[model samples]
Target: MQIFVKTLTGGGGGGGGGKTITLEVEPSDTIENVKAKIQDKEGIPPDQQRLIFAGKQLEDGRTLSDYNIQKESTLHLVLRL
Candidate 1:
């Protein structure tokens, strides 16, 4: 599993360093679980983030395959800035 950490802007402060990050996960890991992992790493509440995978926005209750996410898929996590 390869994880990419990026700093984003355009939130409230609109600077250039936010809590957003991106990750590429194995096929076996569901998107729901991925969210939990992110919460653990970032220490940000789950309710205040958005997960975008395979060009689709994932809600609270869904697996990676639920959004048609496949193996080696890239995930974009947008959070507080």
Candidate 2:
């Protein structure tokens, strides 16, 4: 499935400066997995990323499906500075 990821805060160098981008992910994938991908693609540390879905913060150990995130859904990414 593909989801949209956007940076909500923090300084940005790449990743289009908070521009939303499409990410390919699996429903079985954990939030941490998504964080890792964001880290690789956007240069934000996974440990520093705060992921929000459906207006709630997501847990790293939880699967995307655990949050009911569906295809075309959007997730917010904020970096702790």
Candidate 3:
């Protein structure tokens, strides 16, 4: 399935509203797994990202569906140490 990731424009958590990137992913994909993919797609490192959905922080142990994420759902990626 295809999902979307939204990120702030500036690398260090600056105030840019951000944009979206559509990515190929599965419901079984873990939060850590998706962040790993994003490291390649968007050049953001996995550890630096805090992937969020439905206003809740996503944990590495959970899969997309574990957080009630659906196909085409959009996730927010915030970066910084």
For model 1, the stretches where C-alpha displacement exceeds 4 angstroms are: 1-30
Candidate lDDT scores, in order, read 0.62, 0.86, 0.85
Question: How many steric overlaps does candidate 3 have?
Answer: 0
What would the per-residue lDDT of candidate 3 be over residues 4-67, giving only the tens digit for each residue?
Answer: 9996555567576657888888899999889888898878788789987888889998999899
Q: Show model 2 residue runs off by greater than 4 Å.
A: 9-18
Better of 1 and 2 by lDDT: 2
Ranking by lDDT: 2, 3, 1
TM-score of each: 0.55, 0.83, 0.83
lDDT of candidate model 1 versus the reference: 0.62
**By summed lDDT, which 10 consecutive residues of candidate 3 come out lowest?**
8-17
Number of the predicted model whose lDDT against the real structure is largest: 2
Query: Alpha carbon lDDT of residue 68, candidate 3?
Result: 83
TM-score: model 2 vs. ground truth: 0.83
Deviation (Å) of 76 in candidate 1: 0.6
Worst 10 residues of 1 by lDDT: 2-11
Query: Cα RMSD (Å) between model 3 and the true structure?
Result: 3.3
